[PDB]
From a paper:
In this study, we sought to investigate the impact of changes in Omicron on a uniquely immunodominant spike-encoded [name]+ T cell epitope. Peptide minimization and [name] restriction showed the immunodominant response to be encoded by a [name]*29:02-restricted epitope, [name].
[name] peptide was refolded with [name]*29:02 and then crystallized to understand the basis of peptide presentation. The two residues of the peptide that are mutated in Omicron are at positions 5 and 8. While the substitution at P8 from a glycine to a serine is unlikely to impact peptide presentation and conformation, the mutation at position 5 can have an impact on the conformation of the peptide. To confirm this hypothesis, we refolded the YFP mutant derived from Omicron with the [name]*29:02 molecule and performed a stability assay. The result shows a dramatic decrease of the pHLA complex stability by 14 °C due to the mutations in the Omicron-derived peptide. The single mutant YFP-P8S in complex with [name]*29:02 exhibited a stability close to the one observed for the YFP peptide, decreased by 4 °C. Interestingly, both the single mutant YFP-P5R and the omicron variant of YFP both exhibit a similar Tm of ~46–47 °C which is 15 °C lower than the stability of [name]*29:02-YFP complex. This shows that indeed the mutation of the P5Q by P5R is destabilizing the pHLA complex.
Residue numbers in the entry:
A (entry chain E): 1 to 9
B (entry chain A): 1 to 275
C (entry chain B): 1 to 99
The structure:
């Protein structure tokens, strides 16, 4: 399971 | 006995030619089970192993959502890094990311990972404690301040210690007949004349799973590294792996050499000797 | 950073003349991801050629498996041709049934 982890640089 | 779960994401900018190319893959040990490719027709997270197909629609929709959000964040991220490294819109750039965990044979949590690379080099990484970061330079230190301010490590640690290990244990049970099988290598030895004074002996290990294997040569029960070759482990294409090791021996002394094979699927190590 | 591809040409199974099998070209340890890989029969390109989905190792270098169905003979010769930005020339690795 790939969790929601959309962090911007 | 030990197990791993890995997600690899790749984002390549293609200036002029359109939006970045995105590819995501999911592995349980040495077996790929999911994929997402931006260039594909579906626009969905897709199964790559027969076991994962049994999952319901909510799983596939949540996986699609999470992987699409990753590809889209990468497009913003590709633009922001051009800003940080004062780079041109004409060149191609890559963002790489790895997420995953390690469990023991008993199923306990061993390790969590979150690492990001820019153009093949380290950008930022979550440390083993899952509470601090390692930034590779000044630009990765801008990202670090943001991530420390926004408490990114706590969310990741919760996913790794919770979610990651639970889903892995679930995959291992549901995918047992593939994931937890230990296909012992089928072995054999070949022989080739090099000169009438020297000959090559090749020691083969085929159809094995998992990929971890040790192949060694011995001369009269003593370690031999001189005049030896070892190819890196390669996929056979059907989920199994291949490996070989060779030694150049003097003619008539073939019987003095043994090839020792060690794999999880073997109760005791096998020793091969030419006829 | 830049990294040169390691190349291996081999069959899925021990080759037997007249028996269907798979021909493989395993390219690994390269960076960037842009790569051209061709499987050749008697010096000419095979067109129905599949590849694995792009993935990478600890060091961030990529790997891919290129493959095709084929039936070996005593006549027919096979090889894999790889072009990458790190190569001054497209590398051709010949298929050896005992390698
Ligand atoms: Mg989630
Ligand atoms: Mg076989
Ligand atoms: Na082979």
């Amino acid at each position: 399971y790939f969790p929601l982890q959309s962090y911007g640089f | 006995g030990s197990h791993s779960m890995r997600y690899f994401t790749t984002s390549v900018s293609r200036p002029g030619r359109g939006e970045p190319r995105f590819i995501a893959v999911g592995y349980v040990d040495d077996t790929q089970f999911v994929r997402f490719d931006s260039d594909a027709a579906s626009q969905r997270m897709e199964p790559r192993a027969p076991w994962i197909e049994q999952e319901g629609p909510e799983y596939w929709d949540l996986q699609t959502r999470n992987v699409k959000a990753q590809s889209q964040t990468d497009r913003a991220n590709l633009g922001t890094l051009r800003g940080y490294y004062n780079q041109s819109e004409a060149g191609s750039h890559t963002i790489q990311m790895m997420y995953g965990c390690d469990v023991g044979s008993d199923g306990r949590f061993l390790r969590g990972y979150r690492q990001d690379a820019y153009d093949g080099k380290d950008y930022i990484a979550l440390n083993e404690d899952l509470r601090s970061w390692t930034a590779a330079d000044m630009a990765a230190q801008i990202t670090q301040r943001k991530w420390e301010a926004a408490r990114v490590a706590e969310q990741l640690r919760a996913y790794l210690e919770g979610t990651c290990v639970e889903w892995l244990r679930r995959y291992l049970e549901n995918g047992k007949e593939t994931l937890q099988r230990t296909d012992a290598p089928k072995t054999h030895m070949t022989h080739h004349a090099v000169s009438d004074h020297e000959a090559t002996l090749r020691c083969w290990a085929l159809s094995f799973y998992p990929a971890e294997i040790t192949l060694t040569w011995q001369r009269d029960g003593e370690d031999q590294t001189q005049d030896t070759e070892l190819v890196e482990t390669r996929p056979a294409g059907d989920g199994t792996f291949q490996k070989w090791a060779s030694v150049v021996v003097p003619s008539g002394q073939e019987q003095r050499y043994t090839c020792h094979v060690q794999h999880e699927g073997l109760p005791k190590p096998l020793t091969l000797r030419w006829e | 950073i830049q990294r040169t591809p390691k190349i291996q040409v081999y069959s899925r199974h021990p080759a037997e003349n007249g028996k269907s099998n798979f021909l493989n070209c395993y390219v690994s340890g390269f960076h960037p991801s842009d790569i051209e890989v061709d499987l050749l029969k008697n010096g000419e390109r095979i067109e129905k050629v599949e590849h694995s989905d792009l993935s990478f190792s600890k060091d961030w270098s990529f790997y891919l498996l290129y493959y095709t169905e084929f039936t070996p003979t005593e006549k027919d010769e096979y090889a894999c041709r790889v072009n990458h930005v790190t190569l001054s020339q497209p590398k051709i690795v010949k298929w050896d049934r005992d390698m």
